Symmetry: D4
Subunit: 184 residues, 8 copies
């Protein structure tokens, strides 16, 4: 599961919270911690490095170190991760969601913003959304090419603590209309 | 749970499906059946009539039968249900979702589109989003006024069959990229 | 087929034209004439009145004649035709096209804009796009309900004269770059 | 005509299809197959290599191999084909349509987006839409300059097989409202 | 031509003006005054009432007094003038301009916004843009129906006073970039 | 000055606040309280009933009680107050600001949206923005017509308490970047 | 004034014209011809090279030949003309018009789109709109810097041929609604 | 305070003005002068150069002077000032305002537009809005990092002359309706 310190930090904020805007920031932070928790575990299952916000220009400098970062025409995105194997660049995004809606948004954006640079570099750029459905816990991966490389991916985890914390937050703020209808 | 005939219809479509576009229509139909299943059970818990697409103009004719449907300036919406009690009009929408995003959209639309007609009629119009989180199964109701009227609402149900069917669909179409990234 | 007064005017217009812009106006009028010719012939087959730009408001006054036209909230559309039969209002559009694209546009528009007036009048409003494919000459009608009323409709026509006039036009302007890319 | 394997795959798809959306997908695929058959036959008549979706940057590298693909400021378009001759770049698009509407849309986009790179390279860039009318089978080419380059271009083919497959499709789905009004 | 007082008021405004934004307001006012002058003279030529900003809803109440102005669904526009003759409503706009662009914009808007009220009243509504070219002094009117009604129109005026005033203004402010490019 | 209960509630909110977002909410609430205190004092000086957010339809029913509220075509605006006198309707908005920016925005909206109802009612509708500059304490009123109606209007108040509460808030949160850049 | 052949070509076009859309193309062409005539004469008055559609990237290569046209970040515009003098680039646009509206639109666009390339080259880029009022024949130029360079400009021309041609056109097509309101 | 040459010009402009549009130009210039006066005084307190419209591209050439200005992909902003200290680029904006609204706008804009150039240069870019509240005369700076470098900044000024000039202006144009609602 999630780290004890991390759980306790959430427990403390929820217990201290008295206002809708604070409660909504907790809701949002839980979802991001859940996402990052999956990312870490997924990367351990794949035996790849967990990466800390690598902008696309740095991905390119890593794989083609002769390029000039000051002049290259290159998209401005920061994916969760990437892998360069056998001269294919896999651009990886983690998702934790019961639906694909957020995945389609990310895929379309990344796909469209990377076609030109793929052509300029002569490097195929494969967009890989790795989503886990937090209820079923099944993995859903769009990219057949990526699945060829990793055909048997097992990430044995659950999100029971995020669900518990969220459930606690909504019980504590369940008669605050302002919280119930608050946007992120 | 869900009706056997309804489950079996879903089972049949999933088993016959071979194409991403069909699979996505099933995904969407499951979510609507889940929503309607909650609606029916909720209405039984509240001891109110389950209503079949009543346009707002018909809500007004029901509560103020002297009004002229041909001339009244009135919004064009069709809520899931409504209740007129003690000269308050409660406009009710069901939701089944782990998040409030769809609720905020519906609330803002209904709230904004009903202010003028509320003023024209001199009838307070209260917008009531009744959402059940399908994982926790807790009820979340924005309207304090509605909760005053129904303070102890119990809808003892679950969505295990919708989750099972969806899980089956995603397993069967789990190596179809087109399905995994398909929009409704 | 196309008559005498109309065929002859087209040939005369093609023969005297010398500019791309005049030519394209002919191309456009040919297409409007073809659509109108189909409409007339379809109406002879259905034995219904062929109508001349009757606005929706006039459709209401014909079939619910207590309505006050100064007030009624009615949509601002002018459909090719309409039938009111057994308290169902069918709104009719003619199309001559090898594809359904124009039909979907008209359907979505007419369907959306007639929902509210359907609720006010409590008359269901059925939107019927009647399309003829001018190559196969087969009829395609979306409305199952319309087709129950008129189960075998035979419109035995062809568009050979329109095709011939269009080849005359392209024989004369086929190497005029302005014509070839001129907008409607 | 159309490759025999390709004919047979369409016939099988039609025979095994049961849903409106799969039927529309077959319709759209028939149109793309028809475009591509035309493209293949046209390219034989033009004595150029059959290409589809060429990245514009690849074109620039072919015609000016000393350009640095990492830095050149160039548009992102993927035309069907191209020809570079006597220091003129002809950007070529295949169309199969009874009207010029889609041709105008392609031409306006490609022309607008290549003006700047034409100045930078000091290479005139001529946009050539080559359309065959599938009913008359006449070829219509906008560009005077392209037509002066070539001897009279003749592509003597027909689309009878595509018309026959489409007829089979409508024989099966022509009374399905969802098919009739299905969007691509 | 134009009134003596109106002229003097303009000449005095130009004389005391010292800033671009004031100068530009004068330039705008001269054009509105030109348009209104043309309007008054045209109305004299046609022997019709010169009208002062009538909103469409008041047009409707004039022509169809039984209409309830609280409930009628009607466009919000204010044409320069109108004429109701033989159960036809001519909506009239005056233009003073060397090109038709202004005209096309007013026509398209007035035509589009009046279709529905034409149907509701069962009154044909004809949109008439009467433009005078300030250089040639020729009259251009789009409407055949209106010209059949008035086949012989002579408005024998000129705009020399306006051109002259505009000249003084540009004599004083001609080297001020702020004025030359002021909206 | 400001009611003593209201002062004390602000002071308690400031003292018990710990988060940037709760702090910004207090800031926004101080501004609305300042607006409303001004409104209350101005209304005493104008000898009108203190109102806030009046539905425009209520105004019309007050000034023309024979209007049918169900059918009249009227705008949906909720001004701070209004005055009807000698058949002129003055629509009144309170502002507290050192500049006219928000005043122009309110005036343009209210003026544009009341032209049509002014014609229909045959009642001139004059938009009156009454702004007090919180630093100079001078009153600025756009409408000549409103100012001719009234003897010289004097509202001799100050906003020192609001300035003192704001200072307390910034003493506590002025080194919190999230507060400093927090949006309303 | 304008060339004899050019005149005849126009008069012949009006004579054989019989449709509104052809008539309108003539009206457009007359205005472009007027603008180009003014352009050529202005360039003779200023003793500068009359230029044929130079794109900004070619301007840059003229003035700074060391720039790599494949990589330079530069606006896509095509002004009527330019002048590079004492390491200042004057971007020039000709206008023939009675009002400044056209001018304000071209200025605002040219000014905005050239700021960044001015900084990158370290060259000041001045936008000069040279308008002649076709009625008064007075010249109006926004740019003080340009007028300091050329304080005495006389372009002694008129546009009577264009007005006359425009008159024939409106004589033949003056009762065609389609033409009067054609875009 | 404000000097002699500048104070005197303002008084002269106010004294000779007689039109709303001239008056508002004065109001606007007063506000620009006040902002510039604060900038100058702040820069004296920090002992840094007060800069005059230095474009971002020039900021790059000053601090990474190998950059080619003809090519660098750099944002098109002109901040009030900048410091480059210990390989951190601080981008500085002055504000004089009782609220943070204008500061949030500038922050979000400058932050967004500098992300990509930060990655290319591998220099973090810190956005610093320095706001003075002209009533309290307190300084509010969002950047914790900037405030570590300059831990006690004292800008001992007031805006009394600007306030006095603005009252002269309102004394003279306070009953001119055009002035009162005139836009910048
Ligand atoms: Mn992610
Ligand atoms: Mn619902
Ligand atoms: Mn039709
Ligand atoms: Mn193509
Ligand atoms: Mn007018
Ligand atoms: Mn207010
Ligand atoms: Mn020009
Ligand atoms: Mn600033």
């Amino acid at each position: 599961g999630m780290d004890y310190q991390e759980y306790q930090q959430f427990l403390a904020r929820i217990n201290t919270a008295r206002d809708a805007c604070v409660a909504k920031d907790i809701d949002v932070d839980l979802l991001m911690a859940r996402h990052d928790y999956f990312g870490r575990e997924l990367c351990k299952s794949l035996n790849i490095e967990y990466r800390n916000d690598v902008p696309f220009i740095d991905i390119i400098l890593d794989i083609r170190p002769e390029v000039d970062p000051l002049t290259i025409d290159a998209p401005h995105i920061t994916p969760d991760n990437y892998l360069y194997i056998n001269n294919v660049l896999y651009i990886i995004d983690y998702k934790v969601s019961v639906s694909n809606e957020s995945s389609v948004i990310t895929y379309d954006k990344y796909y469209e913003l990377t076609r030109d640079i793929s052509d300029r570099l002569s490097i195929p750029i494969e967009i890989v959304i790795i989503r886990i459905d937090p209820v079923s816990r099944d993995l859903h991966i769009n990219s057949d090419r990526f699945k060829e490389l990793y055909p048997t991916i097992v990430v044995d985890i659950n999100f029971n603590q995020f669900f518990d914390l969220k459930q606690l937050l909504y019980e504590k703020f369940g008669d605050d209309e302002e919280f119930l209808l608050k946007v992120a």
